[PDB]
């Protein structure tokens, strides 16, 4: 080469992510009581989630 210049290039790298929170009761058995009494059998999925 006998003549040169400077070029620029951009790049993006993801670091974070939106934090999503889900409520088990308000999603499955929001307000009703019979739904809660029936869901009390599955007493491990919500805590694991």
């Amino acid at each position: 080469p006998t003549n040169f210049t400077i070029v620029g290039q951009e790049e993006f790298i993801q670091t974070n992510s939106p934090k999503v929170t889900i409520d088990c009761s308000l999603f499955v058995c929001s307000n009703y009581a019979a739904c809660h009494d029936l869901l009390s059998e599955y007493g491990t999925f919500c805590d694991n989630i």
Binding site: D23, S25, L26, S30, N31
Partner: protein, 49 residues
């Protein structure tokens, strides 16, 4: 736990149906017939209170 506000009132609306026969309009007629000319009227497919 996520609390939910309880509903205060209840609003019920139902589409109408077969029209009223207006028994009171016929009972309040001004042409009162005689016991010899007793008037008979038939009513069906109505909704009376």
């Amino acid at each position: 736990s996520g609390f939910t506000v309880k509903p205060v009132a209840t609003v019920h609306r139902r589409i109408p149906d077969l029209p009223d026969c207006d028994i009171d309009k016929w009972l309040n007629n001004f042409n009162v017939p005689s016991p010899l000319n007793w008037e008979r009227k038939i009513f069906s497919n109505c909704n009376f209170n």
